[PDB]
């Protein structure tokens, strides 16, 4: 795997409609000053989240919702 920490920088808002999934933004604290222009990816999350929560990322360069 890749386990790449990121801090939930804020609650982006509510996306989905099941009452299940929320769409939230992740900020990379994984970087040590390595170049990232991404630089804060939006990620869909499963279950409850809170700000300052670290979580591992199995993927990077995610725009989440897209047009689909």
């Amino acid at each position: 795997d890749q386990a790449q920490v990121g801090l939930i920088i804020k609650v982006l808002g509510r996306t989905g409609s099941r009452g299940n999934v929320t769409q939230v933004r992740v900020r990379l604290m994984a970087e040590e000053g390595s170049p990232d222009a991404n630089r804060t990816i939006v990620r869909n999350v499963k279950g409850p989240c809170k700000e300052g929560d670290m979580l591992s990322l199995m993927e990077t360069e995610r725009e989440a919702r897209r047009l689909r």
Binding site: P35, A37, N38, R39, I41, V42, E63
Partner: protein, 104 residues
């Protein structure tokens, strides 16, 4: 029957033309008169903000170097078309008479 709309859903006034050319739709290919047809102007981005950053990094002569172009188009829609993507919606009586002219 009842005159629901004075201008009849047209920008064509009575006693002038009585005929204005048909125009295709960019959805379903339906034809309607130009005046009836529902015009919008899009100004569609060629990159999302999120991706704009990443590409402007790898650029030197572009992005920072010149502001990115956009795809411009006019979009003439049918009635049914418009309503279903909810960019035109039903309004109460007082509001239906309002216009905003050709400005956004």
């Amino acid at each position: 029957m009842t005159t629901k709309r004075r201008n009849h859903g047209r920008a064509k006034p009575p006693c002038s033309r009585g005929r204005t050319r048909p125009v295709h739709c960019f959805n379903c290919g339906r034809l309607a008169p130009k005046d009836k047809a529902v015009g919008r102007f899009v100004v569609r981005r060629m990159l999302d903000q999120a991706s704009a950053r990443d590409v402007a990094e790898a650029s030197n002569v572009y992005g920072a170097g010149f502001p990115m172009p956009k795809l411009y188009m006019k979009q003439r829609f049918c009635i049914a078309c418009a309503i279903h993507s909810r960019t035109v919606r039903a309004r109460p009586t007082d509001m239906r008479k309002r216009r905003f002219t050709t400005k956004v």
